[PDB]
């Protein structure tokens, strides 16, 4: 795709989220860069409204799959880059098992040479002392597969996957993800065969940062198609 050529080097990234979870209103700003040649993302997020009222790990998936590494032989399946620069809408329902849900609506597009992810997040039905509002999730992140299928009537894709957040007691908080993406612009976009994204993520803290924040290093490779 024409879109793919926008990702052959290092691309600056901005993330901006406004959220309301059970009436706790908050905002997050993030900055970093992506190098899709290596499936590589580095991002630092800051809660600009004070303390984040949900655990940072629960927002990782919401906070740019155009930075996935699609192997050359899978280039024709890369919807995300093909929608660029005009971008795509990315919507999800994230269902925390035995707890509340997030509904997210994001637009991912270029502003100049910078790839921007602007998100609105709404969370409802959370338990006041569940794992989310009670801040019982470990500050770490597991590796997951994102299963992608075409959504031809929307000129886009959908995805399903299961995120597992480690709980401080050693248990796991499941977050089921359902996802739909739709292109914003009028260029041709790629409608993929079934495949998945193999994701690994590492969370850290900036020792000099006293605002509430998260540093994310992530690697993503598309897979599941051999030819
Ligand atoms: Mg700012
Ligand atoms: Mg075929």
Numbering used by the authors: 2 to 64, 68 to 231
Quote the study that presented this structure, word for word:
Green fluorescent protein (GFP), discovered from Aequorea victoria, emits green light after absorption of blue light. Spectroscopic measurements of the photoreaction of the A-type chromophore revealed the presence of the excited state proton transfer (ESPT) reaction, and a photoreaction model was proposed that includes the intermediate (I) state in addition to the A and B states.
The diffraction precision index (DPI) for the average coordinates error was estimated to be 0.07 Å. The quality of the electron density map was sufficient to distinguish between nitrogen and oxygen atoms and between carbon and nitrogen atoms. Thus, the conformations of residues such as His148, Val203 and Gln222 around the chromophore could be accurately determined without ambiguity. The Nδ1 atom of His148 forms a hydrogen bond with the Oη atom of the chromophore. The Nε2 and Oε1 atoms of Gln222 make hydrogen bonds with the Oγ atom of Ser205 and the Oγ atom of Ser65 in the chromophore, respectively. For the distance between Nδ1 of His148 and Oη of the chromophore, average-strength hydrogen bonds were observed in the T203V/E222Q and T203I/E222Q variants. To investigate the interaction around the chromophore in detail, the optimized structure with complemented hydrogen atoms was modelled from the crystal structure of T203V/E222Q by the QM/MM method. The atomic structure of wild-type GFP in the I state (IT) was modelled by the QM/MM method from the crystal structure of the T203V/E222Q variant at pH 8.5.
